[PDB]
Amino acid sequence: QMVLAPGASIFRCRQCGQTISRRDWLLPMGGDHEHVVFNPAGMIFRVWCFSLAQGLRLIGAPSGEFSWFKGYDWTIALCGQCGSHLGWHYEGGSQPQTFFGLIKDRLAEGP
Template structure:
């Protein structure tokens, strides 16, 4: 059976991990970056006036979601959110957004390290 060398190289190529800045846990990877509303990065503020710069990611296996889904003060119309915490140290890394047809993580870029 012939071997597809190019496929083997792609599958064995290490994904470039993105880590929790607090503990070094692998949270997601560059391959998981996505655009939501036309952009990967967004700047928002919460009701307390704290400003967050978020990056959107398809998956974040190093996160655990916490809290009940809510639409209160959502930054993305049609989505409910829950907190996303580091699965290792429980640091707040951002939010998990769930819409009718899609889900994604909005992670606080200052809390990540590439």
């Protein structure tokens, strides 16, 4: 027997294994799921956009300050299990209304 199922379709927190998202939810915001972005202190992040995610904990009220995505406010997204910073939740825009910009290098891909 073999298991017949995708090998790299689920994204989990690299630190604790919490289920976070799926390859099926990758979202090409501005024509690419991948964005290389800088914050006000010059830190460069590599963000992957997903339409849906789970297992996160969103901290604080939304902010538009230095938002990387036009029309969206952001909230910090932690791993709800281990508290690792996994990226940001975006809300208040359109097509879609909400989505997640996740730090790709803090996720592990698997079956």
